[model samples]
Target chain A: PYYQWNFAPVVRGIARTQARVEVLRDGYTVSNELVPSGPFELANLPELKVIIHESDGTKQVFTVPYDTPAV
Target chain B: PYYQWNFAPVVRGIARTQARVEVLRDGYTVSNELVPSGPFELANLPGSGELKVIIHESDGTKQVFTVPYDTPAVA
Candidate 1:
């Protein structure tokens, strides 16, 4: 069930970005209380996303594409 | 800037997040995840079976995705 790709990037909408950083896959969020102050770990997915809720009421999103695992 | 997957980022899209995400097993750093910046890259992340994808939305909506790894497709 990998249909939702815009879950993190589709803004429903900012500040230091230290609020909450979310990593999404197939429209599903995968992090909590995450700070925009570090690197996040993510598994492989055809389409992934990263959403950041800044301290200043801003919603930031990033879309990622990961495919081709010929294993 | 772009949301360059900090797998050792080469661009400035994603914040050059130089901080560390420390995972503790017993007060000791087990996994120190960091976003790659300034010509850094990571390779394959082997070892897995099923990925339990879970997320909590800002609107109080929780969504979960359970997907299997591409490997071991013939077990």
Candidate 2:
């Protein structure tokens, strides 16, 4: 699973509302608020991806070019 | 001058006709073909330093360390 080595964190993109979302990095959590909603271009963001590991040693990574925002 | 914030870009260390010279990460410059010349130990290093900047712009930084041949290769 460890293909994405960009940062020492694991995160996912969760759109909480039209303009807000929860972002996680490492063990830190960040929340984002879009000033103007409706997909107003969160462009040119570097690649962000994550792999999750369960207690039983199973893992999976979910990745998308435009899903996660880089801090 | 900026604090040696880990690295964005800026390096200094020199030894002539010895070991190798290599630039890494961005800009990608690396050369290695020379004999060993030294007083044996480069010692803790990271505390070595230099600073140089020019071209009518008011900005400069010089933080020094060993030539990074010791960077740990993570597997």
Candidate 3:
């Protein structure tokens, strides 16, 4: 099968804008760690980039985007 | 939905073993190719190692995501 790469993220009830934004490079997160949302420069970006807003049961996983700045 | 990170499990036919899951640890793929997804034999693990996962979406959609599953102290 032809592998899918360089596509955007596909979480649930999160896409409400337009721009082909939130790209998925390599392969993004799957680990679930209650998020704190940070950049960490100032950061290495979480293994899964945990972001949060709070919600229902396990509410499925969201791709809370965080930035990785160049030092 | 665009926000649905998980799609249907990838497999050609439901035989004895049918599934292709790619695993990554520290940016390195640990396992690849089909590995019959029908049994759960937890026999290998070390010091709560971290891992990522990659797999093709059902119907050939293609999905890539990491599973941050902290090794449970005890399952």
Candidate 4:
């Protein structure tokens, strides 16, 4: 028997400092948090856009491609 | 400017015991851990046909589950 697990894709990367990251799905904010530097994983999000706001007043925005799971 | 970040999808679920979980990706073991019972998350994996997970329960029951391979894009 198999089970279906639904989850938002996670974004793993490195931050220079404690960065505030926001995840937007369909242009709506879904998750946000302050992440420490080094390796990090941002979970609980849908396919959408992400904004990484660094503590030094730098903001970076990008899109996360859409992917539908097949199970 | 955009930065490229790469990572394997994570498997999140509940554990019924202090379980020893092993993650196999592309026929290679990437991570293994002893996770506390309750909610748990398994990270650091690559996109493969399937992720084979073996969980050794505290009561000596070995459960197996396969997770679908998925790659999330980052730019």
Candidate 5:
């Protein structure tokens, strides 16, 4: 029988200091977390938009590509 | 700026002979193609209801599998 599963794509990025990250899809919020300065990884994400609120008050935005392999 | 892109999930399966594969989402046809015997791969899929897949082999064998869709963070 078919079943439900959680699908989240891993995302990697860098920050100068501890920052807040919010991931959105179709204008909806999907993930909200905080990370320290430097490189970070986010997993379990659907293709959507990503917003990074830096500790220095700067903001970064990105659109995650939808590229899941079907086999 | 944001843009639109094709989202397809790769599916792997096996067959004994050349076969025709049809992938459907929500009763809508999303992919159709021919594949050879043994292991095969399918790509580019949108998350939705159960993936209704129908495989027709050259030997008149029909195989079907219902695959569920998993989207990220939906309450």
Candidate 6:
């Protein structure tokens, strides 16, 4: 199944704007502590980046390193 | 461990709002494949509905569900 990655700050911002924010990322289940949203085409790979923005005008971005475990 | 279920669109909204939305969803690590975020008086069960919203907007209420399981077969 396809996975979902939610950028908290971004969702929060868009909620303020009256604009809907939709984030679609490749994902899979990993014990529930970790979900490796992807940069690659593979379903269960690690995410290279996570970006967030809010409708209230706040935004944050993080580069997810591959070596780091999602847990 | 406790789970974390992030409502993507909601988070996006708050990110814009200048307000920090920290969602504490009860979650577990499932083999690097799945992370089941929860809304429970407990853990390891199914969540009936998931909620999301934009900062300036209340997500018109909707019911969503989440479930977690272990499998013996490989997909």
Residues A9-55 of candidate 4: C-alpha lDDT, one tens digit per residue: 56666778889888777867887999887677775453467788988
**Global CA lDDT of candidate 6, please?**
0.27
User: What TM-score goes with each of the models?
Assistant: 0.31, 0.20, 0.27, 0.45, 0.43, 0.19
Clashes (N, CA, C under 3 Å) per candidate? 12, 1, 12, 0, 15, 66
The B-chain TM-score of model 2 reads 0.19
lDDT of each: 0.39, 0.28, 0.36, 0.69, 0.71, 0.27
The number of the candidate with the highest TM-score is 4
lDDT of 2 by residue, A39-68 (tens): 222211222333333334454444433233
Better of 1 and 2 by lDDT: 1
Instruction: Find the candidate with the highest lDDT and give its number.
Output: 5
Residues B1-75, candidate 1: write the lDDT tens digits: 123322211111121334332322223433334544332232222233443423333344434445344422222
Return the top candidate by DockQ.
3
Per-model TM-score (chain A alone): 0.49, 0.27, 0.21, 0.76, 0.77, 0.27
Kindly provide the TM-score of model 3 when superposed on the true structure, using C-alpha atoms. Answer: 0.27
How big is the positional error of residue A61 in model 5, measured in Å on the Cα after superposition?
A: 26
CAPRI quality level assigned to candidate 2 from its DockQ score: incorrect
Write the number of the candidate with greater lDDT, choosing between 3 and 4: 4
Using TM-score, rank the candidates from best to worst.
Answer: 4, 5, 1, 3, 2, 6
- The list of candidate 6 runs beyond 4 A from truth reads A1-47, A67-71, B1-70, B73-75
Q: Sort the candidates on DockQ, descending order.
A: 3, 6, 4, 5, 1, 2
- Candidate 4: C-alpha RMSD to true structure equals 7.3
Instruction: Provide DockQ values for all models, in the order shown.
Output: 0.04, 0.02, 0.09, 0.07, 0.06, 0.08
lDDT of 5 at A38: 88
TM-score of chain A of 1: 0.49
Q: lDDT of model 5 at residue B37?
A: 81
The candidate with the higher DockQ, 3 or 4, is 3
* lDDT (Cα, tens digit) per residue for candidate 2, span B5-54: 11112233444334443333233433222325331222111222221211
